Amino acid sequence: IEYRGISSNNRVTLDPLRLSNKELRWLASKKNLVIAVHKSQTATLLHTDSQQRVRGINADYLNLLKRALNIKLTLREYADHQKAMDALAEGEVDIVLSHLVTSPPLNNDIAATKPLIITFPALVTTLHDSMRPLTSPKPVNIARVANYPPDEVIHQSFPKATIISFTNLYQALASVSAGHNDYFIGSNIITSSMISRYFTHSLNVVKYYNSPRQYNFFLTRKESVILNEVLNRFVDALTNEVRYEVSQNWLDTGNLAFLNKPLELTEHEKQWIKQHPNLKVLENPYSPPYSMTDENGSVRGVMGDILNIITLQTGLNFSPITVGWDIIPGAIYSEDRENNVLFAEAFITTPYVFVMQKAPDSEQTLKKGMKVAIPYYYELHSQLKEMYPEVEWIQVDNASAAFHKVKEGELDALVATQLNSRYMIDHYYPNELYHFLIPGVPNASLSFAFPRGEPELKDIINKALNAIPPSEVLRLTEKWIKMPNVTIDTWDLYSE
Amino acid sequence: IEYRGISSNNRVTLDPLRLSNKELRWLASKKNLVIAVHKSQTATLLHTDSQQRVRGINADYLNLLKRALNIKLTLREYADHQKAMDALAEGEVDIVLSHLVTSPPLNNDIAATKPLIITFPALVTTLHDSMRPLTSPKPVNIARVANYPPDEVIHQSFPKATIISFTNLYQALASVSAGHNDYFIGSNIITSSMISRYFTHSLNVVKYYNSPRQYNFFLTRKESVILNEVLNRFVDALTNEVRYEVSQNWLDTGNLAFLNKPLELTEHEKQWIKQHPNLKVLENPYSPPYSMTDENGSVRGVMGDILNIITLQTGLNFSPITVGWDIIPGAIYSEDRENNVLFAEAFITTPYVFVMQKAPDSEQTLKKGMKVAIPYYYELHSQLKEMYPEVEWIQVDNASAAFHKVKEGELDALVATQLNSRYMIDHYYPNELYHFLIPGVPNASLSFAFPRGEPELKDIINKALNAIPPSEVLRLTEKWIKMPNVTIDTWDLYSE
Numbered sequence A, B: 001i002e003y004r005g006i007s008s009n010n011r012v013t014l015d016p017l018r019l020s021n022k023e024l025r026w027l028a029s030k031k032n033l034v035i036a037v038h039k040s041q042t043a044t045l046l047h048t049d050s051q052q053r054v055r056g057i058n059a060d061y062l063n064l065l066k067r068a069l070n071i072k073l074t075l076r077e078y079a080d081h082q083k084a085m086d087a088l089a090e091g092e093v094d095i096v097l098s099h100l101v102t103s104p105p106l107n108n109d110i111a112a113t114k115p116l117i118i119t120f121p122a123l124v125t126t127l128h129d130s131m132r133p134l135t136s137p138k139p140v141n142i143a144r145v146a147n148y149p150p151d152e153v154i155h156q157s158f159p160k161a162t163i164i165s166f167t168n169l170y171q172a173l174a175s176v177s178a179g180h181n182d183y184f185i186g187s188n189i190i191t192s193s194m195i196s197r198y199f200t201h202s203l204n205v206v207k208y209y210n211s212p213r214q215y216n217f218f219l220t221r222k223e224s225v226i227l228n229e230v231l232n233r234f235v236d237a238l239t240n241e242v243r244y245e246v247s248q249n250w251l252d253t254g255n256l257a258f259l260n261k262p263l264e265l266t267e268h269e270k271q272w273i274k275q276h277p278n279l280k281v282l283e284n285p286y287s288p289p290y291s292m293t294d295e296n297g298s299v300r301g302v303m304g305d306i307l308n309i310i311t312l313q314t315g316l317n318f319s320p321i322t323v324g325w326d327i328i329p330g331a332i333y334s335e336d337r338e339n340n341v342l343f344a345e346a347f348i349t350t351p352y353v354f355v356m357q358k359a360p361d362s363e364q365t366l367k368k369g370m371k372v373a374i375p376y377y378y379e380l381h382s383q384l385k386e387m388y389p390e391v392e393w394i395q396v397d398n399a400s401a402a403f404h405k406v407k408e409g410e411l412d413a414l415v416a417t418q419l420n421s422r423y424m425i426d427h428y429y430p431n432e433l434y435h436f437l438i439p440g441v442p443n444a445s446l447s448f449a450f451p452r453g454e455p456e457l458k459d460i461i462n463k464a465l466n467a468i469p470p471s472e473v474l475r476l477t478e479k480w481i482k483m484p485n486v487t488i489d490t491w492d493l494y495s496e
Helices: A021-030 A057-068 A081-090 A151-157 A169-178 A188-198 A225-236 A240-248 A267-275 A301-314 A381-387 A402-407 A418-428 A455-466 A470-481 A490-494 B021-030 B057-069 B081-090 B151-157 B169-177 B188-198 B225-236 B240-248 B267-274 B301-314 B381-387 B399-407 B418-428 B455-467 B470-481
Strands: A032-037 A072-077 A095-097 A110-112 A121-126 A140-145 A161-166 A183-187 A203-208 A218-221 A278-281 A317-320 A328-332 A348-350 A352-357 A371-375 A392-396 A413-417 A433-437 A444-450 B032-037 B053-055 B072-077 B095-097 B110-112 B121-126 B140-145 B161-166 B183-187 B203-208 B218-221 B328-332 B341-343 B348-350 B352-357 B371-375 B392-396 B413-417 B433-437 B444-451
Touching: A021 A225, A032 A057, A032 A081, A057 A072, A057 A225, A057 A240, A081 A095, A081 A218, A121 A169, A121 A188, A140 A169, A151 A161, A161 A169, A169 A183, A169 A188, A169 A203, A183 A188, A188 A203, A203 A301, A218 A225, A267 A455, A301 A317, A301 A328, A301 A455, A301 A470, A348 A418, A352 A402, A352 A418, A371 A381, A371 A402, A381 A392, A402 A413, A402 A418, A402 A433, A402 A490, A413 A418, A418 A433, A418 A470, A444 A455, A470 B418, B021 B225, B032 B057, B032 B081, B053 B057, B057 B072, B057 B225, B057 B240, B081 B095, B081 B218, B121 B169, B121 B188, B140 B169, B151 B161, B161 B169, B169 B183, B169 B188, B169 B203, B183 B188, B188 B203, B203 B301, B218 B225, B267 B455, B301 B328, B301 B455, B301 B470, B328 B341, B341 B455, B352 B399, B352 B418, B371 B399, B381 B392, B392 B399, B399 B413, B399 B418, B399 B433, B413 B418, B418 B433, B418 B470, B444 B455
Parallel strands: A032 A072, A032 A095, A140 A161, A140 A183, A278 A317, A371 A392, A371 A413, B032 B072, B032 B095, B140 B161, B140 B183, B371 B392, B371 B413
Antiparallel strands: A095 A218, A110 A218, A121 A183, A121 A203, A328 A444, A348 A444, A352 A413, A352 A433, B095 B218, B110 B218, B121 B183, B121 B203, B328 B444, B341 B444, B348 B444, B352 B413, B352 B433
């Protein structure tokens, strides 16, 4: 009905599958497999090159399936989905690779493997409206493709929403890019895909949702018992590490493949998540790009986005609270404060810097009789007091508000972390301040903190943190250093 | 109780044995040796094939023994190990080839040769967790086979470790690959051989230990004075060169047979090793894949692993906490730097490359007005300004952070090492950067460096490096090019 080839780099490789000898003999005389595919509406899942070969994320997985089983593939695209299923029932094809669906088919003449592709819904807005709250009780125009996701899930975040269903993904994203619709919500695997290709200058993702996910499946006849158990053996070998590398070939931002598969949790940790589904997040002082809050008091910044990722990884949900709390979104490890809280393993390391006025006569040094501010929760005060007994050291309640005091010349310097200084300078005092490293001081190690009788939440977050690729933490830090603001807070910038 | 033959690929031929005339008459009159063997649980040491012939690592050595002594060999498998030892008492067998043991049996009848197979403990983890520290006071789950190594050894590295003891090596390694257990530790010649077979893309060795080693022996009755001496003649002729080629056929990675036997060290050198322990290693800038420091401050990367190997070769003892220094782990040779340090002989050469952004209109030369960064400790600034005097050449303190500046368009190019650029691009900026060779410059030559007054250490490292096969260095760089970090450091990756 159609014939093709596969076009893919074999950069991703799989361990050998453990197949029975009855399965190994079945594959050898089967020799070849006919799979019914189809071009996706967007190019991400499956497209064709000039040599009439197939390409995309689905092609990369098919390439792995071809090698993991040591069997030949024949790719056909039928006119519709129904003629493909007719060929499956007739025996013209062995497998049908389904389009993106919300659930597998239940008719028992069909057998479905475990899901191949697993993707999540994403909230998309303009780059200059990203810092606005991700929920609203006010009227709002929300775009979507077809009926994904349904009305009621959109209404949990925007109860007064007017939903506009588009035929096409590009058209729906462009309507937000122009300004007709305030948000778009849709499948992330294809939304992140196209934003980087067409709307990179104008749109970005601000939130992932845990449900309702979309999948595609391999589909066989119910009679093809051995084929389905072999296909399932191949899909189980597709770990978060394997899925991440496959999707790296086609996604820049929005690669959530590292959390397609669950984490290795004890049955006690799984019961604990089950009995504590919604935890409270203590509010941090303003410390961009790590911990920031929007007008609704919800955690944004890198720590806020990591919390979004942890939700998809673990199922835990987090709600705002202000200064019965359960998690601190971003904290500096210290020996003293460990007697007050419990620390997760560090996932960001950063150096301490001195922030000073950028003038012609600037020297990268402290001087006798300078006024240098340092936040009280950095217990560097004792060590700098001995390195610089010459300096008048001023403990401060509000770290971010001390930048302005340096800009006005009241303070000679201020102690901060590298990227916290870069944000404050670029966003609020460009070309007015600079920084340099503090010599002879250990690095800061950022992570989450908890109440101290919470071993389960600590051990669970540690597993989730260890599962996040470091390049995703780097992309998130790039994202939030460049993120435009919509408000200024007088207290975070001018207190005292 | 069960009888076989010998299968092997005679790729290794041994030098003729210096045998006494009295011994050749004994071998001529004996004419045949009854040797009790046993099938290892893995195929690496001993298995059988189609014709019921012995095959494996033990088989290749038995083949060499048959040709070294020019005698016939009958191999028998008794029920358990105690029945083979019983048969050796009554004289029914001449030799018993032992299983892997940490010691030869105490029995004061039983004579053991020098060790035949020599193997070391190995710590194993998943590839994506390999940058976690090799020791930790934190709770961990360690998998092992039976009771090797003992708990007191495992607790030296992990005092709060839960040790799960498996009966079967495959299941133990599978538990680490699936994420249930954090590490595995066990006999290397068995562990790495099975990783080559089934876990090549999910498990790898991260550390070899000096002790407790494991061996197998030729066990005879002490009555056999002539048999024992002829057996020791054979075992003494198994040089590093011979053992490495025998293990080559069954181990693709982690083949430590090149350090089974001691190096040809002088008396003075051996005394220097034993009388200068806890040698101090200088910390290098973040320089992947050659050098980088984990969350413990320990040296990792290719240079870090080669130090671990050098320790197993020579007994050199390096401090795990880096810095009054005794060795620079990896350094580019320079004739003018030789006034400050001594260099070992180079064992890796690599060219310099320009890093630029991957655009459609990219073309592989510089232009004038371009801002190109070069590390200040590279001594190419002299020559590069004369070849490209129309270019603005900027010295930088942080080579790894300059990659980001090129990505952002603030720099036009960056001077780097081929594999240094390959790592940064592969892991942090894929499809956003590329590189091409710098024309008309020599290659950088990598080796260890030492203070001026340490000739003995430099002479030892030279002998050790010469004994490391280049394929193992190639094996190590493959591993570290593909290996990501476990955390990000903002100073390593974010510019100024």
